[PDB]
Design a protein around this ligand. Structure first.
Ligand SMILES: Cc1cc(C)cc(S(N)(=O)=O)c1
Ligand SMILES: [Zn+2]
Length: 258
């Protein structure tokens, strides 16, 4: 009886195995746009993915992860609200059963169809496992997805999904360029939070872009053909793998723009 997204093991149960679920800096949150204050001390985000080297894509039974080679100084997030440099390790998505839900963060209570998380660890801690033990260990860049025009730079991801349908399947996935997933503007909101699945560690500086990317209905429909189950087990479509907004508590959300 491990955690997941069902009536029987979903977000409202996680606190039993992971008490920090009811902690002081949990994610995601609703971004109330009128209350977020412009911070003129915030810097432009620096996203440098020119040398990113993808290796593999993995269905982990909750989502799929596009994994990177993080053994050299290459694909780095810095600037913005961050001190120091954060190295890209993986990206994944959260999405809905319907276009009207699927994002983790919300904007004035608006739910997007999906949300992309580009995960980076602070190089001052030497690797990911040590970084997640620190309050400034990770920086997660969150990007909303809406359904409209296709995102060409997403299609290589979509087309490999047939080969990782079920939990525990992986496939080689080299030379994927995550720059093709970024919107035009790097305007963002930022706040201190957590991982959004167990273990729910309070180790993340969240940077959520204001501009969503557009993906087509056909692209998100192929996300929804993935399975949470393993091969040879009853089919459970991989949909609604998002955590609802959590209490903001004693936090401020800052805007990079206005
Ligand atoms: C458990 C966990 C691990 C990683 C690397 C990333 C997340 S999230 N969804 O907060 O980006 C969760
Ligand atoms: Zn995530």
């Amino acid at each position: 009886h491990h955690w997941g997204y069902g009536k029987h093991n979903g977000p409202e149960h996680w606190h039993k195995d992971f008490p920090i679920a009811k902690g002081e800096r949990q994610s995601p949150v609703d971004i109330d746009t009128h209350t977020a204050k412009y911070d003129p001390s915030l810097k432009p985000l620096s996203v440098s993915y020119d040398q990113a080297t993808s290796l593999r894509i993995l269905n982990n039974g909750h989502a799929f992860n596009v994994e990177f080679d993080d053994s050299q100084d290459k694909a780095v997030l810095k600037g913005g609200p961050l001190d120091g440099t954060y190295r890209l390790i993986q990206f994944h998505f959260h999405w809905g059963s319907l276009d009207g839900q699927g994002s983790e963060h919300t904007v004035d209570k608006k739910k997007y169809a999906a949300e992309l998380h580009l995960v980076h660890w602070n190089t001052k801690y030497g690797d990911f496992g040590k970084a997640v033990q620190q309050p400034d260990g990770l920086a997660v860049l969150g990007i909303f997805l809406k359904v409209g025009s296709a995102k060409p730079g997403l299609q290589k991801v979509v087309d490999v999904l047939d080969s990782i349908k079920t939990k525990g399947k992986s496939a080689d996935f080299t030379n994927f360029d995550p720059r093709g997933l970024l919107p035009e503007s790097l305007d963002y909101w930022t706040y201190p939070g957590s991982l959004t699945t167990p273990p729910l560690l309070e180790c993340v500086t969240w940077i959520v872009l204001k501009e969503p990317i557009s993906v087509s209905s056909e692209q998100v429909l192929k996300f929804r053909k993935l399975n949470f189950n393993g091969e040879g087990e009853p089919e459970e479509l991989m949909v609604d793998n998002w955590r609802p907004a959590q209490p903001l508590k004693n936090r401020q959300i800052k805007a990079s723009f206005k």
